[PDB]
C-alpha cells in the first residue's frame, strides 16, 4: 500500500513524483534527504525512515532513490517488490536508468506511474505486455491484461521456432580464514530466451530428485533442489502434485526458475593466501590458486580480487600465468587469468611498500573474491532432459540449452 | 555403435578390476547433442551386447553401472540414468523401456529376455509409479 511513488536523485530534488492517495503531502519528500543524511551519519540506517507518522520506504538505484511514502500499516514486502518492479519496467523501456532518462521521458513516465499502480495497489507490471498500449512512439488494452494468461499476447508469429535456455549456476562460497568452508551453496537460475509462435504449453523436465524418487530411479545422478522459486508462468499446483514444470512462456528474456541447493563437495577455485605484513615496511602475497574442478573444462577469465592495504605503494608482481593489474580505486590487486584449466595451480607473489608513518584509522579486512566463469560445466549436476512443446497449431520447435557456472559472492575471508 | 568398440575391452577391464562388493563438478560435451537411450537405440545396444559378447553371465554391481554410464555419456551422448533396475525384493528388472536383460541373483548376473522391450515386467512389479 504505497501512498506516493517518488523518484529522487542523489541530492534530494524530485525528478518525478506521482501520488496515488493524497494521504501523504507532496512536500514530505523534502524531509527525506535530511533524515537519510541524519540516519546515515549515526549508523542507524534502514530502508524504512520515519518523519513523524509518514514512513519512507525507499530503494537506491544508480542515481535514483525511488522513495515511496506511506502512512498506514503499509505492506512493506508489497512496496519493495513494487519498487524493484518499477526499476525493472524502467530498465526495460530505458536501457539505462539515470537522471538523463527521467527528465527526457516525462511524456511516458507519468503514463507508466498512472498505469502500474492505482491507489497503492500494483496491477499491471509485465513490461512485454505493457509495451503494447504505453509506448514512447493509444489502442484498446490487450486481452492479455484481462485474461488469466497475463504475460503473453496471443498471435505472436515467428518464422523459426527457437527456445533458448541458460542453466546458469552461481557458486556461493565463504571460506573462513582458518581454512574451512562455511557456506558453500549454489544458486542456479534457468534463464530462458523464448521465441515461439502462438500460445504454447511447455513442460520442462529436470533431473529433480523428488521426480526421480517418485518414479523409482533413486540411484542415478539426481540434483537435490532444496528450494525452487519459479516464475509466475509456471503453474505451481501441478508442480506441487507430482513435480511437473508446465508453463506458458512469455516472449523474450526472463528467469524461469531460481533454484538453490547446498553442496558439501570441495570449492571449485581455492585461494591459499598468506600475508607477510611487516609493520611500517612492506607486505607480500604468496597466493596460489588451485583449480579443483575437472581437467576438461576451462575457467574463462577468472579475476582473483585480493585486498591490499589502502595506502600501499610501488608494487612488484611475480606471477606464473596471467596479468596482474593493481587497482587502487578499490584497493585490491585484480589478478586476472584468461584461460585457467582445471587441475592446474598458478602461483602469484605481490610485493608492496608501506608508508613508514602509520595510518590514522583502522581499515578492516575485505575478502578475496574471485570472478570465475566456467562454461559447459554445471557444478550441482542438473541436466535438462526435455522440453515438450505443445501447441494447438502443431509444429516442430527447436529447443536449446547451454550451461554456465559463475560466481555468486565467491568470497574467501583473509588473514 | 562405432565409438563403443575401442572401449569395449578397456572399460570392461576397469569394471572387472573394480570390486563388485582433486575433482568436483560435471562437465558437458560441447555442442554434441543429448538424448536418452531410446527404444531402437536400446534394441541396437542389446544386439551389440548379444553379438560382440562379454556381458552375459557376468557379476553385476552398482559401481560397474556408474563407471559404464559416465563412459556412455562421455563417449556417445546419452543421459546416464538409462541403466536403472528395480530394488531388492524380487528380480532386479530394468525400469527402462527397451532393456532386454533381467538381473537374477547368482550380487547379480544378466539373463536375456526378449519381451522386456514391450511387455514391461518392471511395470508389473511397480504399477503405481508408471501411471
Amino acid at each position: 500500500s504505497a501512498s506516493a511513488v517518488y523518484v529522487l536523485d542523489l541530492k534530494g530534488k524530485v525528478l518525478i513524483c506521482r501520488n496515488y492517495r493524497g494521504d501523504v503531502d507532496m512536500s514530505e519528500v523534502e524531509h527525506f534527504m535530511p533524515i537519510l543524511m541524519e540516519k546515515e551519519e549515526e549508523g542507524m540506517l534502514s530502508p524504512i525512515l520515519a518523519h513523524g507518522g509518514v514512513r519512507f520506504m525507499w530503494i537506491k538505484h544508480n542515481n535514483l532513490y525511488l522513495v515511496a511514502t506511506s502512512k498506514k500499516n503499509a505492506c512493506v514486502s508489497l512496496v519493495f517488490s513494487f519498487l524493484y518492479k518499477v526499476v525493472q519496467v524502467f530498465s526495460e523501456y530505458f536501457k539505462e536508468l539515470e537522471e538523463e532518462s527521467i527528465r527526457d521521458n516525462f511524456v511516458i513516465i507519468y503514463e507508466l506511474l498512472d498505469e502500474l499502480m492505482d491507489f497503492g495497489y500494483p496491477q499491471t507490471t509485465d513490461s512485454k505486455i505493457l509495451q503494447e498500449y504505453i509506448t514512447q512512439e493509444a489502442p484498446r488494452p490487450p486481452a492479455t491484461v484481462t485474461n488469466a494468461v497475463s504475460w503473453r499476447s496471443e498471435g505472436i508469429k515467428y518464422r523459426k521456432n527457437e527456445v533458448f535456455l541458460d542453466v546458469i549456476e552461481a557458486v556461493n562460497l565463504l571460506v573462513s580464514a582458518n581454512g574451512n568452508v562455511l557456506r558453500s551453496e549454489i544458486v542456479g537460475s534457468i534463464k530462458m530466451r523464448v521465441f515461439l509462435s502462438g500460445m504454447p504449453e511447455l513442460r520442462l523436465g529436470l533431473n529433480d530428485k523428488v521426480l526421480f524418487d517418485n518414479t523409482g530411479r533413486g540411484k542415478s545422478k539426481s540434483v537435490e533442489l532444496e528450494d525452487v522459486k519459479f516464475h509466475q508462468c509456471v503453474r505451481l499446483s501441478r508442480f506441487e502434485n507430482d513435480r511437473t514444470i508446465s508453463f506458458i512462456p512469455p516472449d523474450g528474456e526472463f528467469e524461469l526458475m531460481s533454484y538453490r541447493l547446498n553442496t558439501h563437495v570441495k570449492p571449485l577455485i581455492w585461494i591459499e593466501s598468506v600475508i607477510e605484513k611487516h609493520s611500517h615496511s612492506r607486505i607480500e602475497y604468496m597466493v596460489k590458486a588451485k583449480s579443483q574442478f575437472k581437467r576438461r573444462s576451462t575457467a574463462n577469465n577468472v579475476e582473483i580480487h585480493i585486498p591490499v592495504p589502502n595506502d600501499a605503494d610501488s608494487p612488484k608482481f611475480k606471477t606464473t600465468v596471467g596479468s596482474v593489474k593493481w587497482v587502487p580505486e578499490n584497493s585490491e590487486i585484480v589478478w586476472s587469468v584468461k584461460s585457467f584449466p582445471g587441475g592446474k595451480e598458478y602461483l602469484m607473489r605481490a610485493h608492496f611498500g608501506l608508508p613508514s608513518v602509520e595510518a590514522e584509522d583502522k581499515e578492516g579486512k575485505p575478502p578475496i573474491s574471485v570472478k570465475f566463469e566456467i562454461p559447459y560445466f554445471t557444478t550441482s549436476g542438473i541436466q535438462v532432459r526435455y522440453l515438450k512443446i505443445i501447441e494447438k497449431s502443431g509444429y516442430q520447435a527447436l529447443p536449446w540449452v547451454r550451461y554456465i557456472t559463475q560466481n555468486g559472492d565467491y568470497q574467501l575471508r583473509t588473514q | 555403435s562405432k565409438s563403443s568398440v575401442i572401449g569395449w575391452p578397456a572399460v570392461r577391464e576397469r569394471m572387472r578390476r573394480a570390486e563388485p562388493a582433486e575433482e568436483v563438478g560435471f562437465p558437458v560435451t560441447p555442442q554434441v547433442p543429448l538424448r536418452p537411450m531410446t527404444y531402437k537405440a536400446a534394441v541396437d545396444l542389446s544386439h551389440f551386447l548379444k553379438e560382440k559378447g562379454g556381458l552375459e553371465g557376468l557379476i553385476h554391481s552398482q559401481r560397474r553401472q556408474d563407471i559404464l554410464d559416465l563412459w556412455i555419456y562421455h563417449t556417445q551422448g546419452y543421459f546416464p540414468d538409462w541403466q536403472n533396475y528395480t530394488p531388492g525384493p524380487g528380480v532386479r528388472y530394468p525400469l527402462t523401456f527397451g532393456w532386454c536383460y533381467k538381473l537374477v541373483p547368482v550380487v547379480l548376473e544378466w539373463r536375456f529376455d526378449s519381451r522386456l522391450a514391450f511387455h514391461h515386467v518392471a511395470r508389473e512389479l511397480h504399477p503405481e509409479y508408471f501411471k
Binding site: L165, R385, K388, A397, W400, V401 | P33, P36
Partner: peptide, 13 residues
Amino acid sequence: TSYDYCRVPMEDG
C-alpha cells in the same frame, strides 16, 4: 553470448 548451445530432445514421454 559468445558460447554455443546444445539441442535437447522434444518428447521423452
